[PDB]
Write a protein that binds this ligand. Structure first.
Ligand SMILES: CCCCCCCCCCCCCCCCCC(=O)OC[C@H](COP(=O)([O-])OCC(O)COP(=O)([O-])OC[C@@H](COC(=O)CCCCCCCCCCCCCCCCC)OC(=O)CCCCCCCCCCCCCCCCC)OC(=O)CCCCCCCCCCCCCCCCC
Ligand SMILES: CCCCCCCCCCCCCCCCCC(=O)OC[C@H](COP(=O)([O-])OCC(O)COP(=O)([O-])OC[C@@H](COC(=O)CCCCCCCCCCCCCCCCC)OC(=O)CCCCCCCCCCCCCCCCC)OC(=O)CCCCCCCCCCCCCCCCC
Ligand SMILES: CCCCCCCCCCCCCCCCCC(=O)OC[C@H](COP(=O)([O-])OCC(O)COP(=O)([O-])OC[C@@H](COC(=O)CCCCCCCCCCCCCCCCC)OC(=O)CCCCCCCCCCCCCCCCC)OC(=O)CCCCCCCCCCCCCCCCC
Ligand SMILES: CCCCCCCCCCCCCCCCCC(=O)OC[C@H](COP(=O)([O-])OCC(O)COP(=O)([O-])OC[C@@H](COC(=O)CCCCCCCCCCCCCCCCC)OC(=O)CCCCCCCCCCCCCCCCC)OC(=O)CCCCCCCCCCCCCCCCC
Ligand SMILES: CCCCCCCCCCCCCCCCCC(=O)OC[C@H](COP(=O)([O-])OCC[N+](C)(C)C)OC(=O)CCCCCCCCCCCCCCCCC
Ligand SMILES: CCCCCCCCCCCCCCCCCC(=O)OC[C@H](COP(=O)(O)OCCN)OC(=O)CCCCCCCCCCCCCCCCC
Ligand SMILES: CCCCCCCCCCCCCCCCCC(=O)OC[C@H](COP(=O)(O)OCCN)OC(=O)CCCCCCCCCCCCCCCCC
Lengths: 63, 77, 129, 62, 80, 78, 65, 78, 78, 78, 129, 65
């Protein structure tokens, strides 16, 4: 359930948007979620905190 | 259980993302840390095992003390 | 640095003397008398035997194939054979997965150019890796 | 209560009892999952999600 | 001996030294499973449950099961 | 004027304060064992019985430290 | 010559065949991905050429010969 | 008005407080050994059973110090 | 409104608190040596074994002190 | 918004806290020199050996005192 | 598909019969009578012997270290020992190079960000590899 | 117990040590390169932030409040 929520929220906010991806992309996203789970509180915070100047999409990307 | 979860998370993190140090020149530090983690794991499990039984003992003893506080014993003659 | 080496040598000597295998002790004594290495000799003997048993392996493979194809193997099938076959299937599956990983030379499937994940490749911290 | 039962003297004896055979199989699973995670989650081709900053549990529970 | 927290039970002696010294040992009557019996390794000669199945083989089987469990999705991924 | 402010970082401060409660608990446990050693040397025949009572006291004293530690987690995870 | 009590050789051959088949699967996947990327790069170069031609045409119109 | 503020450096403050929890732990450990010497001096034949109990008390006291230290490092990295 | 503030003098405050735990260690040392002298007077024959045990107690207590001291220095330079 | 603040006078507060670490160190010394008298009065023949051990304990406690003193001065002139 | 298999089996049988090793033939006959595999038994025997000879290897290593350190090895040094030492040095060098390649996980040294070759990394045809 | 005619064990130990040393060399090189790339990426992000701030300042001047 957590994995599906992450995939949905990070890739369109809707189930169909996620299904628009390929199986390999879903695998990559889910493995990144596993990475985040393993890091927990003992790891780098750039995985969820966007450093200033980063070019990657922000929180308002789909809004 | 909070403590167990946190320690297990830390152990998973170090074991997965820092085991390559075994092949590196700082392998001794990783080995020391791993041994300490194993010792802490064993100690926590033993402590929890003992504490659960002890807490059940105390839980029943409080009720029995309530009962005993109002018991009166007669002597046979 | 020296006391530790002496202690390790003493422990290994004690363990070597402890074993009660007549053949192992006899070989050790003979090699010590001759000054040769027993382990290396054993390795060479094993390699020679395997080199001389290659065609024996081939013949055994063909005989086993005939035994299985003839249906005689399944006639006496038991639970132990089922356990062995399950082990065999597990090894086949894991080997197939490892072979695929090595064949594509990557743990994960490669990203197609049209995928939206290409940005991740562009934003690699170290392009060399 | 840990009173008695079969107790293998060393690793090689774990095959002398079905229960300990299952136990050693389980131990193998347990210990071998860690190297698998090392290889899988430290892979060169592993890539962070580009949209990882779009959303996170930290903002959700906050 | 011990294997983690599991300790091997030991039979308490029942005979006195005088009576014990008068006992004649005849291993010919003992079963083949227990000859040269050693309290520190009583199961050395015990038969294997499955012939040719070593403990290391089972350990490797479990490791392979773990590898499959972790790597199958990498080779046969499925959509949500 | 009416101004409402919500400082996030304060939860760290409260968490650290609760940890101070462990200073008494840790000290209290050491007191029990100190008496245990000084009692076993006065009546070794009861060492097993005393060891039992020492452990019971350790848990009761330890139980309190858990109460404080729970509050630390509550505020540290909220 | 009694019947074989074990099938070790056949199992080893099957192990090799399974590993080989996995290798073939991975190689096919990698080759397909490489072909896709080659085509993508070719398209990118073609688009760059078209953009350069359009820019040159606009500059020519500005020249007004 | 609704104002949300996020103070960064507070985690240093909370971490320092948890470090104070080691004051009682260090004192408690010292108390155990001090009592151990008296028990040994007043009953010199029990130089091992007392030593074992002293180690057991230290382990439990160390455990309490480690529970606090986990929060001290955790907040320092939060 | 979302406001982020970074105070650069609060890495000093946390450092001072971590140093307070040293008192619980330093006092613990005196307790071990406070009772070592008494034990020596009680049983002068064991002037050696008691001294070794006291050294063990001092080292373990000092170990707690250095665990706290590590946090003190980390926040001083970070 | 990103706001960086640098409070200058907080380097004094950290210095003051580290000074409290001396409270235990000074007290620990008093404990040693308190039991020393009792040990000497009980066994006056061993004043020299007890006195040497008292000096040893004082040196060990003073070491921690300097550690705290070092931190205080660093946070004072920094 | 079947004639080829029969021909291969016949060739292997001829070669197996050709060898004139008494021990190999005796083992083959015994295993055929019992229906077991000789090669697998040899493998297990070799592994058992090596497992029982580990501490023998340790003791031999310490003895060889003492022999070399004592200077007795160089007292009787000959040309053959020189040849062996050259072989040893060559293996050391090749192993060092292989170890470096594996350690950096790349045949070539990684490109620094300030190098002008970074463009090549940017212009990779397949970023996945 | 005569003197050893061969030094196989010492040679094997030396082989392992040489491979290990090579591995250490490669690991050190890779770690240094990774640190360099991390610093380069940090500098790139800082430059991007400065450029964005300059653009925002110019837009503010155009606003003319
Ligand atoms: C990206 C792609 C890149 C591709 C690059 C290119 C690839 C290669 C292409 C081809 C190139 C040309 C060919 C080169 C061949 C070279 C190899 C070769 O021929 O070997 C034969 C050669 C023996 O030949 P020989 O002398 O003719 O033998 C005569 C008899 O046959 C002897 O018979 P025997 O009976 O002795 O048989 C057993 C013998 C033969 O066995 C073998 O043949 C072994 C396998 C041979 C191939 C090895 C290739 C190695 C390449 C690099 C690593 C790759 C992975 C290898 C995995 C191997 C798994 C077993 O076993 C050994 O050799 C044993 C070696 C291990 C010794 C372990 C001792 C450790 C002691 C540590 C003590 C520390 C104390 C510290 C105290 C400090 C106190 C202050 O053996 C070796 O050279 C062995 C090298 C082993 C290196 C292992 C390195 C592992 C990584 C480092 C360790 C990290 C983890 C642990 C760290 C712990 C903390 C320190
Ligand atoms: C009849 C014609 C003659 C030639 C005429 C003139 C030339 C004509 C042109 C063509 C010539 C072709 C080449 C010559 C023949 C070579 C094969 C041969 O005869 O070997 C016999 C030889 C037995 O002769 P022997 O003198 O009785 O040896 C006694 C023992 O070897 C015991 O020896 P030792 O006492 O010295 O022991 C030394 C030590 C040393 O042992 C070792 O070190 C074992 C070797 C380890 C691998 C090192 C690299 C090997 C070379 C690969 C590259 C070759 C490139 C060139 C090939 C060209 C082929 C055309 O051994 C051990 O300690 C045991 C090894 C245990 C370790 C096993 C695990 C190894 C793991 C390797 C890890 C690295 C893998 C790479 C990836 C790593 C990633 C981290 O059998 C073998 O052992 C062969 C094993 C290797 C097979 C594949 C080799 C490559 C392909 C060869 C194709 C040849 C086709 C011929 C067709 C003929 C049709 C009629
Ligand atoms: C006392 C406590 C007991 C446990 C208590 C409860 C649990 C407590 C928690 C901790 C438990 C630790 C783990 C249990 C112990 C495991 C070791 C053991 O006892 O094995 C004995 C075992 C002998 O027992 P046995 O029952 O007499 O076996 C008879 C024969 O094995 C014959 O067996 P077979 O007849 O079944 O033969 C099957 C077949 C099958 O043989 C094989 O397949 C050989 C294995 C091949 C490798 C497969 C992966 C192995 C697993 C690696 C990952 C392990 C992760 C988990 C480790 C956790 C350790 C904490 O064999 C062969 O055909 C011969 C193999 C020839 C091939 C050699 C070349 C292999 C090349 C591999 C290529 C792949 C490399 C990677 C890169 C590839 C790239 C393209 O000795 C070995 O053979 C060990 C070899 C491997 C050593 C390293 C293993 C991993 C690290 C273990 C550390 C353990 C520390 C213990 C400290 C204790 C202090 C007091
Ligand atoms: C990027 C990083 C990624 C990392 C991924 C993860 C890495 C691994 C981590 C660990 C994972 C969990 C553990 C998994 C372990 C699995 C392996 C294992 O345990 O093995 C033991 C297992 C035996 O265990 P067992 O059943 O308990 O054995 C009982 C006794 O001990 C038996 O004792 P024995 O006396 O029999 O001892 C000898 C035995 C044991 O020896 C060994 O232990 C061997 C080494 C074991 C490790 C193997 C790992 C393989 C992994 C993939 C490849 C990596 C490179 C490996 C290099 C190996 C060099 C020797 O030898 C064999 O196993 C022989 C196998 C080869 C048979 C060759 C026959 C070929 C016939 C072809 C005929 C074609 C005719 C066509 C006609 C068509 C007409 C139309 O052996 C195998 O599974 C062998 C697999 C070999 C696969 C080789 C694949 C090579 C690539 C494909 C071929 C491409 C070139 C040639 C193409 C030619 C054209 C077609
Ligand atoms: C006409 C007839 C034609 C017939 C054709 C037949 C073709 C057969 C082709 C091969 C089929 C193989 C099937 C089995 C493998 C399935 C793999 C799979 O689905 O994996 C995904 C699943 C996992 O699914 P998953 O991918 O959802 O899980 C991933 C989960 N995360 C992401 C969290 C990591 O793998 C497993 O569940 C692996 C479990 C182990 C499998 C092996 C078990 C062996 C037995 C062990 C127990 C007994 C031990 C006893 C010991 C003691 C004895 C005394
Ligand atoms: C008669 C037979 C026997 C005769 C023996 C005679 C001696 C031969 C000795 C052979 C020694 C090894 C040969 C190596 C071949 C080439 C290896 C290589 O470097 O190729 C990998 C290469 C990677 O590069 P790629 O991204 O594909 O594209 C590069 C373009 N810039 O990509 C490619 O080149 C594509 C390869 C696709 C197919 C892969 C096939 C192998 C799969 C399993 C490999 C497992 C290797 C494990 C080794 C681990 C190393 C650490
Ligand atoms: C007590 C000891 C024994 C105990 C045994 C218990 C069981 C343990 C079993 C261990 C099994 C293998 C463990 C694998 C460890 C991790 C492997 C891995 O994937 O790491 C390589 C990884 C590559 O990724 P990188 O580009 O560096 O960065 C990724 C960031 N996105 O990069 C890194 O992670 C950096 C690694 C640097 C150091 C390298 C050390 C190894 C060098 C030689 C390796 C040779 C392997 C050959 C295998 C060939 C496979 C095809």
């Amino acid at each position: 359930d957590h994995v599906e929520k992450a995939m949905i929220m990070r890739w369109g906010g809707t189930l169909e948007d996620v299904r628009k991806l390929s199986a390999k992309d879903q695998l990559r996203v889910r493995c990144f979620t596993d990475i985040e789970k393993l890091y927990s509180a003992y790891g780098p915070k750039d995985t969820y905190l966007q450093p200033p100047g980063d070019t990657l999409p922000g929180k308002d990307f789909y809004r | 259980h909070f403590l167990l979860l946190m320690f297990f998370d830390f152990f998973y993190f170090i074991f997965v993302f820092f085991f390559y140090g075994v092949f590196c020149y700082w392998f001794i530090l990783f080995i020391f840390v791993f041994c300490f983690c194993l010792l802490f794991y064993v100690f926590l499990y033993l402590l929890d095992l003992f504490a659960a039984i002890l807490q059940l003992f105390i839980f029943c003893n409080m009720i029995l003390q309530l009962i005993m506080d109002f018991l009166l014993f007669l002597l046979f003659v | 640095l020296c006391n530790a080496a002496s202690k390790v040598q003493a422990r290994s000597a004690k363990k070597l003397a402890a074993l009660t295998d007549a053949g192992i002790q006899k070989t050790i004594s003979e090699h010590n008398a001759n000054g040769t290495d027993a382990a290396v000799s054993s390795t060479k003997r094993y390699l020679a035997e395997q080199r001389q048993l290659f065609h024996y392996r081939v013949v055994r493979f063909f005989d086993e194939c005939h035994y299985i194809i003839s249906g005689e193997y399944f006639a006496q099938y038991t639970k132990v054979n089922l356990i062995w076959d399950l082990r065999f299937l597990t090894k086949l599956v894991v080997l197939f997965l490892i072979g695929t990983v090595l064949g594509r030379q990557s743990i994960f499937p490669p990203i197609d150019p049209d995928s939206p994940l290409v940005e991740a490749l562009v934003t690699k911290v170290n392009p060399n890796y | 209560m840990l009173l008695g039962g079969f107790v293998p003297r060393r690793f090689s004896q774990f095959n002398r009892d079905p229960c300990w055979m299952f136990f050693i199989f389980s131990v193998g699973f347990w210990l071998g999952e860690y190297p698998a995670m090392m290889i899988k989650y430290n892979a060169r081709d592993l890539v962070y999600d580009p949209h990882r900053y779009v959303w996170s549990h930290h903002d959700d529970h906050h | 001996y011990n294997m983690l927290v599991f300790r091997d039970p030991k039979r308490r002696p029942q005979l006195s030294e005088e009576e014990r010294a008068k006992v004649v040992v005849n291993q010919a009557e003992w079963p083949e499973e227990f000859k040269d019996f050693d309290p520190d390794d009583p199961y050395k000669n015990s038969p294997e449950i499955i012939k040719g199945m070593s403990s290391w083989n089972l350990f490797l089987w479990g490791v392979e099961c773990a590898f499959i469990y972790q790597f199958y999705e990498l080779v046969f991924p499925k959509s949500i | 004027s009416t101004v409402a402010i919500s400082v996030q970082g304060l939860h760290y401060v409260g968490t650290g304060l609760a940890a101070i409660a462990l200073a008494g608990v840790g000290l209290g446990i050491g007191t029990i064992f100190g008496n245990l050693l000084v009692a076993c040397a006065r009546q070794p025949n009861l060492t097993k019985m005393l060891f039992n009572y020492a452990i019971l006291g350790f848990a009761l004293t330890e139980a309190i430290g858990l109460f404080a530690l729970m509050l630390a987690f509550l505020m540290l995870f909220s | 010559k009694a019947a074989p009590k074990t099938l070790h050789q056949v199992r080893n051959v099957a192990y090799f065949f399974a590993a080989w088949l996995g290798v073939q699967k991975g190689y096919i996947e990698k080759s397909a991905n490489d072909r896709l990327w080659v085509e993508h790069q070719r398209k990118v170069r073609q688009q760059n050429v078209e953009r350069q031609q359009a820019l040159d045409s606009i500059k020519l119109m500005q020249q007004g010969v």
